[PDB]
Every structure is written in structure tokens, then in C-alpha cells.
Design a protein around this ligand. Structure first.
Ligand SMILES: [Mg+2]
Ligand SMILES: [Mg+2]
Ligand SMILES: [Mg+2]
Ligand SMILES: [Mg+2]
Ligand SMILES: [Mg+2]
Ligand SMILES: [Mg+2]
Ligand SMILES: [Mg+2]
Ligand SMILES: [Mg+2]
Ligand SMILES: [Mg+2]
Ligand SMILES: [Mg+2]
Ligand SMILES: [Mg+2]
Ligand SMILES: [Mg+2]
Ligand SMILES: [Mg+2]
Lengths: 121, 153, 206
RNA sequence: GCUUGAGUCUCGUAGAGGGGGGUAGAAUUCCAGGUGUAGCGGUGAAAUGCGUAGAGAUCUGGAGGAAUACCGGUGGCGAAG
RNA sequence: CGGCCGCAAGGUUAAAACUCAAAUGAAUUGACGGGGGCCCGCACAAGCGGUGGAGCAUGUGGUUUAAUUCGAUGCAACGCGAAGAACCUUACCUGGUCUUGACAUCCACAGAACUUUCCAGAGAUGGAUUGGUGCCUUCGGGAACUGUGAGACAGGUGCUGC
RNA sequence: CCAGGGCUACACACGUGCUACAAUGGCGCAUACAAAGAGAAGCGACCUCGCGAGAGCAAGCGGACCUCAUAAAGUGCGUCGUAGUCCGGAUUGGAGUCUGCAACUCGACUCCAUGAAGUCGGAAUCGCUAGUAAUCGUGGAUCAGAAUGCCACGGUGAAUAC
RNA sequence: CGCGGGGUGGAGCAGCCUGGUAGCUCGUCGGGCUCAUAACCCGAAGAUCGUCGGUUCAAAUCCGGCCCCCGCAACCA
RNA sequence: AAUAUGCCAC
């Protein structure tokens, strides 16, 4: 809501951000573009065909390469969504492998920073 | 298979007695292709049982087998919701194979020392209907008797 | 599915070896590298002459290279001034005395390597690939090959989706080992990428 | 004017064509009783349900309602239902 | 909606605004069926022996780290590329260094190469230098091998197997 | 380009294997029977030394000749007598051999010692119908060293299929 | 305000009335079947009982208050 | 006897 109510995935309290590194790995200005799209997720307009609840509560945010494939698996943790993994994929539909990695990161975040987010945040 | 098997593989009768029935017994008892060990164990069991009883080794073996051999077993048929335990009469070759297999299972599961001792004791118990093998035959026949209603098939 | 090499699966049966020198484990690697260098140099320097086949033998500390070519006059030149230079460089590469022997290839229209090279040159020259393939098949079946198959695969005609098209006439029984299937490949480096040409020519039996 | 359309009369024909009235046998159900015991009934299995207060089964006698086995037939009749 | 009919359920007559570029019928080729018929395969059934439990080896995912290089990841990835990571390999990381370059051609100049030895530096690399100063020869120059000097380029296990 | 490090990290999860859980066995002593392959800065006899890995001198052989290289399971005798055990070998301590400039991260092997979990494995799941499965050893490629993997070779050798 | 109750894993409930110890279902986690998910199958963990202070050798239990949540009552003029 | 589902341009 304050244009930055995002939380990036860490494996623990001081666990080196396992998403910021996998995000810096993303080639070139796709990083800035995806930051823009996160801002747009907090804007409330981010266009059609870009977001998809893949399976579970895991939402794929998409960008480019072939057809919207600079993919980012996140999930909504209250008002502030948590960005799990960010990855390049070629074929449509995030590989099952990457999906299952996203699910496991979701569960790990739940068991680290909490199951439901704080009362007021 | 969906075609048909040729004639059964030829089996060389065992040297000490020349009985293909005993050859099959040795083969069934054999583990990891150690026929020498299987034959030694079977021969020791046979001589031991012959000495404890008095019968010839071959005829005593036949008596122990006969007290364990079934006549009707149960096979599974599908109609719906539940399965039919249809009782089917057994052919003699399968009778002997099953008797040998049950004897060997009981002997292996017995708690003695040398397997020759285990086999001699198990066959001796079969000679008066006491072993786990004759217990298994009892179970097979009483299960078939219970399911006898399905026999008509 | 993938298919076995029509030459390799027949080498010991109805084909010859393009190299018949004997050496032991001390010499095998060096002789193979030198044969590779000689063949590469010869093909590069005789791209124009249409060299159909290069056989190499090593009798005794010597190298004999038989060049089955379709323009022996072209590869020889005046008297022998061209083959002399070729022999000199071949000897220098192989580190041993050389002997180049030119072999007449009658009918470049029944030789898989020459057909493939012709088709690739046309493809570079931007001729229609369907026309090139039909021309090759017609030429071979008029020269009298019992059968021929031509396959061209790649970004044909500037397409962005690579496809494969193949023409055929007569019989090309690749499964029969005794059948004379002369097969060979070539590549055409067009401005839109590489295009692969494969030619099978069935010339007869035993 | 005419009769070949249309219609009437004379003789017969086949039909679950319609409306009204009566009756027949088979069967299910119920009621009364007799014999007669622990099961019955049901399902793919099961349970709900019925039964030792005596069911189910079987026999006798009633009551009442509904529908008409066989004939029975891409058979018949009817404008259709 | 309004008339008419109805006791009501509702029937009958009967639009419009908007919205799409189709909806539809019959046949055709496949595919599919918890449709049928006829078959086959260690597919089941009949047997034997395993895995899943234990310790270890190995690969993978995940965490971790500066790096834990990259690839394969339904069957048809996971003792797979890799027929064999101490340095090398090695592509990754931390630092020390070089930029016509380690490797190619071509331009010019210098110098035979080659061998040995001393210093410093983790080594790269830089200082030197003992010996060497030739092989053909239009004997003057070229052939080699080395350094230097600008490049035209070289280099890329960087991306894209859609 | 160079030296160090990493690819060998470990709360975990999965795949594929190896060794086991024992008496159809373990250990000790004697002994029989193979196929196929490799080899020249390579295979390395014999002999001497070492408890062993191995070391010294060193023939022979690019080989139907020599070496690798005594096959093991099997057979004969003894022992153990059902016990977490003379099963089982993980882990760890000390001492060492070889390769390689170099074995700390991170090698293999040997000796002494330690001797773990494991008593046949839930749901589930795999291979196999013949000399196959099962079981026992041998060789090779890669390779300085570094196989339980991979690729081959033989020995013993079944049950079952209505 | 008086009176009767209640506070128990992440949710719903037992247990407590007879002080010697906390269970059920759903859920969660791990594996399995599935191309994948749901259902399903097999294993596991999880609350130290609202809270303070007493009693007692021992308190979820007994007691006294305190906090919050329900229910009844808060009338006659 | 039970046997629900499958949204990522092509
Ligand atoms: Mg693809
Ligand atoms: Mg109306
Ligand atoms: Mg089976
Ligand atoms: Mg496990
Ligand atoms: Mg296991
Ligand atoms: Mg990796
Ligand atoms: Mg390294
Ligand atoms: Mg492809
Ligand atoms: Mg690795
Ligand atoms: Mg031991
Ligand atoms: Mg070797
Ligand atoms: Mg090796
Ligand atoms: Mg074998």
C-alpha cells in the first residue's frame, strides 16, 4: 500500500536473501521491469495475462522472453506479498520442478517469519 | 503368456536316489544357485528322517509330501464390489510343487540349528500332521470349503 | 527416429574404407590426426574441383592419396603444376613422402557427395530448394540410378521455422546391408543459417 | 344442361373407435385362524426395516382397490390426443 | 410491458436496449469412450529375488557459502553430459597482473635460435645475464624461431536448441 | 595469465547402487575348475626385505611365448551353537606404503585398536520365463594416483506360466 | 451491577465433579498412489491447561482474587 | 462398488 509492502524470501531471520540473489541473477533490466511490476501489484492495475495462480496459493508474475517468461513465483502473505523465487524459463508454464521449489520456500517462510503476518502491517 | 508354453524343462533325477520328485525338491530348496549345498542338506535330512522313523528315504519323503499335498485351492475372480474366492481343483504337478514349497517355507521358518535338522524335523512332523506345512494345507482346504458356494464356475 | 549411417553399417560388407593403413597403438593417433589434416587441406584447396572422395594409404613411411574427383583436368592443371604443389604440401603436413593419384569420376550425377555439394552450392546461390532437389533426383534417375532420396532440412527459403523436405524416386532400401547405398551429407552456410543436405543413392545389389 | 368430382340408398365386412352398465379369473396388500420354527427382507457389500409380543414360509375364509398374463402381431381402429 | 384467457400454476399474442462475428445442418480424416469384437507385450496372473527400513557410495532438490560452474529434471532427468574435480581439468570465487593480446593472418623494425645461471615476487611477471650468434643465399635477403611497435582483427564454456 | 579456494559445503528430502542383518553362515587349514581382455617414459617374473600396503636389484615381453594373474563361489576337516554373537562393518585414534611439485580442505591402500546402526524393513514399488533370474569372481576404458559406477567375461544355476 | 457457568495443541471439543498423567476430529509436516492436483494410504510432531497468588510432598484440577467471553436477573412505585 | 478436476497463444 505504501508502494513497497513487499517482502522477499529469506531462509531464516538473517538468512542471505534467497530471492534477491536469484533476482540479481535475472539477466539485465528485467530486474527493474519486475520491480515496476511489483509496484504495479501494489498499484492495482498490472495488466491481463501477466499474473496467474499456478497451483496452491503460488502466483506467477510474468514478463518477457518468447511470451511473458521472466517468471517470478510469489504468494500473498496478508497485505504484504512475499516474493519466493525468480527465474528464467523458456517453455510456457513454469516447470513443475520450479513450482515445487516455490512451494517449499513458501512453507519455509511460514515456519520462519511466521504463519500469518502481524496484526497491523 | 498369451500363447502356450512348450513341454516342461527336462530335469535330471538326483544321483543318490534317481527321483525327479527329489530333484524338484532340491531345486526348490536351492538358494542363489548353490545346488551342491541344497543336495547335501536334503540328503542329510533324508537319512536323518529315515533313521528316526525306519522307512526308506523315498517312501518316507512321499508320506510326508502326501500329508501336506492339497487337493483344491482358491483363486480370485472379478465380478464387482467384492472378489470371488473360487475353489479350483489342483493338478498333481502343482500339488507336488505346492507341497514342497510349503514344506520348505515351514522348514526355513523353524527355529532349530542346521537346515538339514530343520527339514528333517519338519518332514517328521508332516509324517503325523503337525507342521506349519500341514497347518497351511488345513487353512487352504478350510478356506476352499468356506468358499465352496462359488465352486460351480 | 534416428537412423544408422548407411556407410558405417556397410563398411565391412559392401563398401570400402576411405583409409586402409595399418599401425599400432603408438602410431594410430598421429596417423589419424595427419590424415585429418591432409583431407581438410585437400578439401579446402580443391573446393572448386569437386573432390568426391579421398582415400589415404600409408605403405611404408609414405602417404599415397587417391583423389576421386569429377574434374581431373581441373585438379591436375597444366602438365602437373597443381598436383605437384598439392603433393608438396601434403608431404609437408604428413611429415613423409607423398604420392597423389587422381581418379576419374564419371557421372557426378550418381555420386552422393557431388550431388550434395551441387545442391548446397545452389542453396547458397539462393535457388529454390524444391527446384534443386527435383533437378538432382531427375538427373540421377536419368543417369540410371536404381533409386535416389534427397533430403534438405533447415530454415528453407528464409523461413523462421526450420522444416525438412525430402524427395525420392525408385528404391532406397536402407535396411538391406548388401544394397549399394552411396550416402553423403553436406552443409550450406546461407545468410539465414545452415541448411543440411543428405543424399542416398541406391545403385544396385551385390 | 352432363357426369367422370361430391353425396344418398340397397347388401355385407373387419376393427383395443366412443359413452354407459355388469361380471370373470390370476396376482399383490390387509384382516381372522391353523401348522411351524429363527430367521426374513435387502444389497456390489451393508445397514435402516420386519421377527421369540412369535415373523418369513404354508393352508383356509373373507375385504377392497387397481390393471387385464397367454392371444399379441414395424397387427387393427381413430382426425389427432 | 400491455391486452385476452385461468381459481392458481400459468397459457396465448409479443418486443426492445445492448452484445458477438458468428451460431448452425450433413458428411470427412483422426483422436477419444468408465462402447463392442478380435489380438499382442514380464501387462497382469504363477513363481524367484529385490527397493522402501539400516550404514556406506553416488547423483539430484533444497539450504549454505565468496564460489558451492553450466547443462539434463513426467515415463523418455537424477552411478545422467562426467570413459574417472588434489594443482590441471575449471567453465565458478578471492585477490595479483595483461591488454592487437595465450592462440590466426597480414605491416615494420630489431634480433639467429637455443642453453645455463642470479635476484625479487604466492606465482604470474619483471630485472638481468653466462654461454649462443646459425640454417640457404638474388653471397646484400629471405626461410625459420623471438621481442618490440599501430592496427585490420583475434578471443567469448556470453544469450538464444522457440 | 597466475596462486589459493570451490565443484567434496549439510537441519534435511528423493533416485540408483554396495555391504549387511547370519549357521544354505563366519573363521582357520588343504585343494580343484574359467573365459575374456590389457601392455613400451608400459605390464612387470624370479630372488631378497617388510606382519601388509610395498621397497631393492632386475630378467622376459609390443606378446597363442612374458607379465598382469593363485579365479571365487565349490569340495574335505575342525571350530563357533542362535548370541547384537568369531554376524555385521560404519565411525574414530595411532602408526605407515604408493602416485603425484604437492594427499589440510580433498586420494587409494595397509597394520594395530574401536567396534556402531542393523535381527528381513509401512503405505507403496521394481526386475526376470531361461543358462534367464539369483549368486561368485575376472578384465577393460577413462587414468600419475583415484569404482560399490559403466562396459564385457566366465563359474554355479532354479520356480513358475491354469 | 448481582447469580450460573467458560477459558485446554493452529480450529472445534473432551478430561477436570472423585488433586499423582492432558486426549478426539479437522488441520500441519514427511513419504506414497497420480502426468499433476483433490480425495485416499502410511508415519510424525504439536498444547505444559487465561492469569496472579496460595494450599499441598505434588495443582489443568482445590481455593482466593484479577482479566476476558456467554447466559439469567437488574423489579413495585 | 466407488473413478472430481486440468486457463501457460498455438
Ligand atoms: Mg524446449
Ligand atoms: Mg403477460
Ligand atoms: Mg505378478
Ligand atoms: Mg530414506
Ligand atoms: Mg534403503
Ligand atoms: Mg548442479
Ligand atoms: Mg581446481
Ligand atoms: Mg527441439
Ligand atoms: Mg559433482
Ligand atoms: Mg567379522
Ligand atoms: Mg588399465
Ligand atoms: Mg586407473
Ligand atoms: Mg554371469
Amino acid at each position: 500500500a505504501a508502494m513497497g509492502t513487499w517482502k522477499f524470501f529469506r531462509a531464516s531471520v538473517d538468512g542471505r536473501p534467497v530471492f534477491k540473489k536469484e533476482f540479481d541473477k535475472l539477466p539485465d533490466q528485467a530486474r527493474a521491469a519486475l520491480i515496476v511490476l511489483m509496484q504495479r501489484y501494489l498499484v492495482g492495475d498490472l495488466a491481463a495475462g501477466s499474473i496467474k495462480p499456478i497451483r496452491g496459493d503460488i502466483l506467477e508474475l510474468r514478463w518477457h522472453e518468447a511470451n511473458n517468461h521472466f517468471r517470478v513465483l510469489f504468494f500473498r502473505w496478508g497485505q504484504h506479498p512475499v516474493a519466493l523465487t525468480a527465474f528464467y524459463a523458456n517453455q510456457q508454464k513454469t516447470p513443475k520442478t520450479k513450482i515445487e521449489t516455490a512451494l517449499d520456500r513458501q512453507k519455509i517462510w511460514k515456519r520462519a517469519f511466521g504463519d500469518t503476518p502481524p496484526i497491523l502491517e | 503368456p498369451r500363447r502356450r508354453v512348450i513341454g516342461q524343462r527336462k530335469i535330471l533325477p538326483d544321483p543318490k536316489f534317481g527321483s525327479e520328485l527329489l530333484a524338484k525338491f532340491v531345486n526348490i530348496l536351492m538358494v542363489d544357485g548353490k545346488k551342491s549345498t541344497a543336495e547335501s542338506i536334503v540328503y542329510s535330512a533324508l537319512e536323518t528322517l529315515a533313521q528316526r522313523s525306519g522307512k526308506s528315504e523315498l517312501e518316507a519323503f512321499e508320506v510326508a509330501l502326501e500329508n501336506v499335498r492339497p487337493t483344491v485351492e482358491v483363486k480370485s475372480r472379478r465380478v464387482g464390489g467384492s472378489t470371488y474366492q473360487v475353489p479350483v481343483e489342483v493338478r498333481p504337478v502343482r500339488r507336488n510343487a505346492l507341497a514342497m514349497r510349503w514344506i520348505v517355507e515351514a522348514a526355513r521358518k523353524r527355529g532349530d540349528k542346521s537346515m538339514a535338522l530343520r527339514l528333517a524335523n519338519e518332514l517328521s512332523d508332516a509324517a503325523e500332521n503337525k507342521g506349519t506345512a500341514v497347518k497351511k494345507r488345513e487353512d487352504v482346504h478350510r478356506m476352499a470349503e468356506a468358499n465352496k458356494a462359488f465352486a460351480h464356475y | 527416429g534416428q537412423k544408422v549411417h548407411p556407410n558405417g553399417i556397410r563398411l565391412g560388407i559392401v563398401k570400402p574404407w576411405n583409409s586402409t593403413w595399418f599401425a599400432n597403438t603408438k602410431e594410430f593417433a598421429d596417423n589419424l590426426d595427419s590424415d585429418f589434416k591432409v583431407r581438410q587441406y585437400l578439401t579446402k584447396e580443391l573446393a572448386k574441383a569437386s573432390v568426391s572422395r579421398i582415400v589415404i594409404e600409408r605403405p611404408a613411411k609414405s602417404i599415397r592419396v587417391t583423389i576421386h574427383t569429377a574434374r581431373p583436368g581441373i585438379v591436375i592443371g597444366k602438365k602437373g603444376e597443381d598436383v605437384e604443389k598439392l603433393r608438396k604440401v601434403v608431404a609437408d603436413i604428413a611429415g613423409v613422402p607423398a604420392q597423389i593419384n587422381i581418379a576419374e569420376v564419371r557421372k557426378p550425377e550418381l555420386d552422393a557427395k557431388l550431388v550434395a555439394d551441387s545442391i548446397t552450392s545452389q542453396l547458397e546461390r539462393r535457388v529454390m530448394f524444391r527446384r534443386a532437389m527435383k533437378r538432382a533426383v531427375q538427373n540421377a534417375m536419368r543417369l540410371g540410378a536404381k533409386g535416389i532420396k534427397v533430403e534438405v532440412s533447415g530454415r528453407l527459403g528464409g523461413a523462421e521455422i526450420a522444416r525438412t523436405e525430402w524427395y525420392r524416386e525408385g528404391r532406397v532400401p536402407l535396411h538391406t546391408l548388401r544394397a549399394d547405398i552411396d550416402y553423403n551429407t553436406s552443409e550450406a552456410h546461407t545468410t539465414y543459417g545452415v541448411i543440411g543436405v543428405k543424399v542416398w543413392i541406391f545403385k544396385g545389389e551385390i
